[PDB]
């Protein structure tokens, strides 16, 4: 995080960070871990449960996040087909 | 009077779907170029996060009268780092 004496505060991209900050189960702890190991939400969504679980540190949090990425509100609003 | 919203399942369902759609709407809403109804439009087209991120700019522009430029903005936030700055794409930066 640069050889400057400046904090990273100036260098954050509002859009993608917020995208991650709006994710369920993802508290700031998890967010920081993610911005440390992961570049962007794309890596995140490409990650497997175990991967994201190791980064998040919490199995429960990881489930919320992972499942969300792979689910839809449509499922829950009307379950017509689906194994879950 | 109506035999619905009677089980605990109804509550689980209602709050889950509500929270789901809320997070999905909000997530797409994080783009300054995207308005709240814009996110709604991505919801009627893909209704899922995986489907959004797996969608390219052209797919996001395919979405009914929503915004080809919005697609450009969405794709950008989807593939841009949170720190905004990379360690090195074509030119290697300080890494730390």
Curated annotation (Swiss-Prot), chain A:
Changing residue 79 to Q: Mimics acetylation; promoting interaction with ERCC1. Residues 5-73 are annotated as: HhH2, dimerization with ERCC1. It comes from the Eukaryota. It is found in: Nucleus; Chromosome. The modification N6-acetyllysine is found at residue 79. Transmembrane segments: none annotated. Acetylation at Lys-79 by KAT5 promotes interaction with ERCC1 by disrupting a salt bridge between Glu-75 and Lys-79, thereby exposing a second binding site for ERCC1. Deacetylated by SIRT1. It is linked to Xeroderma pigmentosum complementation group F: An autosomal recessive pigmentary skin disorder characterized by solar hypersensitivity of the skin, high predisposition for developing cancers on areas exposed to sunlight and, in some cases, neurological abnormalities. The skin develops marked freckling and other pigmentation abnormalities. XP-F patients show a mild phenotype. XFE progeroid syndrome: A syndrome characterized by aged bird-like facies, lack of subcutaneous fat, dwarfism, cachexia and microcephaly. Additional features include sun-sensitivity from birth, learning disabilities, hearing loss, and visual impairment. Catalytic component of a structure-specific DNA repair endonuclease responsible for the 5-prime incision during DNA repair, and which is essential for nucleotide excision repair (NER) and interstrand cross-link (ICL) repair. Heterodimer composed of ERCC1 and ERCC4/XPF. Interacts with SLX4/BTBD12; this interaction is direct and links the ERCC1-ERCC4/XPF complex to SLX4, which may coordinate the action of the structure-specific endonuclease during DNA repair. Belongs to the XPF family. This is DNA repair endonuclease XPF. It comes from Homo sapiens.
From Swiss-Prot, chain B:
There is a cross-link at residue 32 (Glycyl lysine isopeptide (Lys-Gly) (interchain with G-Cter in SUMO2)). It comes from the Eukaryota. Changing residue 12 to A: Impaired interaction with ERCC4. Disulfide bonds: none annotated. Changing residue 17 to A: Impaired interaction with ERCC4. Changing residue 10 to A: Impaired interaction with ERCC4. Residues 9-86 are annotated as: HhH2, dimerization with ERCC4/XPF. Ubiquitinated with both 'Lys-48' and 'Lys-63' linkages. Deubiquitinated by USP45. Belongs to the ERCC1/RAD10/SWI10 family. Heterodimer composed of ERCC1 isoform 1 and ERCC4/XPF. Interacts with USP45. It is linked to Cerebro-oculo-facio-skeletal syndrome 4: A disorder of prenatal onset characterized by microcephaly, congenital cataracts, facial dysmorphism, neurogenic arthrogryposis, growth failure and severe psychomotor retardation. COFS is considered to be part of the nucleotide-excision repair disorders spectrum that include also xeroderma pigmentosum, trichothiodystrophy and Cockayne syndrome. This is DNA excision repair protein ERCC-1. It comes from Homo sapiens (Human). The gene is ERCC1. The chain holds residues 220 to 297 of 297 of the full protein.
